[PDB]
């Protein structure tokens, strides 16, 4: 019955990945975008320039107020509401309805997208990060609870407008291609994960692992960037630079700025590295690697020009609050959010990137000594 759920998320490039549901007696249809790097469910209930459509609580028979205030700061972006509770379903997903805490945002800074057709959020993370604290149960949870719903769900997204798959309560083995190769969620609260390892075309980037994952390395659907610490960002860039010295490129192209552009077909694949992430694994001194091609972390955006090339963003950021990984490095994987056995799992996805030599890939076993002492304390 997974079938039913295979493609039911759409988006725009660099504005994440949504899914329908229905919020409220009776039904309100609502896009809601799906961000694993958060544990608030939002949704707009107030007019916006950006929304085309919003929840109108006078309108459900099951709402229920909780009279109590809430708001949330990203990263980028915030908003502010109030919360109650309401009847949910999820159409392209499980045939269950549940009451779950809503955040009517009544106000919000920069962070509903123009023209992007999604009106919420859908956080899939643990209680711990809730606003305003973690009594508030988060929508996966109150799912779990109330329903049949096994503890786990896993996420196919497609690159280049988009679209993939939220699979509710289990894996679709059609979906991805080789051996899943877990990681270990080191605590639950964001989806984190420990980097033990990082290579650029296979050349070590010689650091201490903490430095990967200072503070925290988390996996982030609600981001589209890969995101790294300050020390590790600059010997990755330094590393993509200087693969890539053939040509030459706008020092804010670097800090994801301005984009460049090639003439359509000619953009140089071959000159940007591929990056190796090693992430723990499930036995002892074992981990694994993700490989990401240059088509994941250079995003292609829209040229506002009177020319019709093939113009780019670089989406990789510097951080000051730990690893992100975020939507680019997500796509082309099937990630599975196990949080029954509080793992994360990787495979090559069906919907997998292309490059003419060079393939992604997630490969192991790798040994690793010493593991323990990447982990941030
Ligand atoms: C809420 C608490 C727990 C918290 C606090 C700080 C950091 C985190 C880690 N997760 C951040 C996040 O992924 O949830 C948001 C989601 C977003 C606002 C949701 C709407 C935007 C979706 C499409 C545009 C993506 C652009 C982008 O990449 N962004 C806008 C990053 C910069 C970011 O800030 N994304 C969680």
Redesign the pocket.
């Known amino acids: 019955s997974f079938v039913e759920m295979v493609d039911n998320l759409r988006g725009k490039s ?3 990945y949504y899914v329908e549901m229905t919020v409220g007696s009776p039904p309100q249809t609502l896009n809601i ?1 799906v ?1 694993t ?3 608030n469910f939002a949704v707009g209930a107030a007019p916006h320039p950006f929304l085309h459509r919003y929840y109108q609580r006078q309108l459900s028979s099951t709402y229920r107020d909780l009279r109590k205030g809430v708001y ?6 915030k908003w502010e509401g109030e919360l109650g509770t309401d009847l949910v379903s999820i159409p392209h997903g499980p045939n269950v309805t549940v009451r779950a805490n809503i955040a009517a945002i009544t106000e919000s800074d920069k ?1 509903f ?1 123009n023209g992007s057709n999604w009106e919420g ?1 859908l956080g899939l993370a643990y209680a711990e ?1 809730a606003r305003p604290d973690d009594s508030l149960e988060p929508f996966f949870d109150s799912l779990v609870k109330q329903t049949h719903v096994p503890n786990l769900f896993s996420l196919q997204l497609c690159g280049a407008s988009v679209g993939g798959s939220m699979i509710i309560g289990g894996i679709d083995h059609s979906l991805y291609t080789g051996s899943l190769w877990y990681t270990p969620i080191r605590r639950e609260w964001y989806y984190e994960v420990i980097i033990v390892r990082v290579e650029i075309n296979g050349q070590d980037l010689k650091m201490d692992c903490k430095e990967y994952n200072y503070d925290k390395s988390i996996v ?1 659907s ?4 890969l995101r790294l610490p300050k020390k590790v960002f600059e010997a990755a860039v330094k590393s993509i630079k200087a693969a890539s010295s053939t040509e030459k490129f706008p020092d804010g192209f670097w800090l994801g700025e301005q984009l460049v552009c090639w003439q359509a077909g000619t953009t140089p694949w071959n000159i940007f590295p591929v990056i190796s992430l090693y992430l723990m694994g499930e036995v002892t001194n074992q981990s694994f690697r993700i490989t990401i091609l240059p088509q994941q972390y250079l995003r292609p955006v829209e040229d506002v020009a009177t020319s019709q090339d093939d113009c780019y963003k670089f989406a990789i950021s510097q951080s000051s ?1 730990g690893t992100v990984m ?1 939507a680019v490095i997500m796509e082309g994987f099937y990630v599975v959010f196990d949080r029954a056995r509080k793992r994360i799992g990787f495979a090559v996805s069906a919907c997998h990137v292309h490059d003419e030599f060079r393939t992604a890939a997630v490969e192991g076993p790798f040994v690793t000594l010493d593991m323990e002492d990447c982990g941030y304390n």
């Open positions: 660099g504005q994440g975008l961000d790097g958060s544990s949330v700061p990203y990263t980028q972006g962070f997208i959020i990060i982030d609600g981001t589209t960037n609050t975020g």
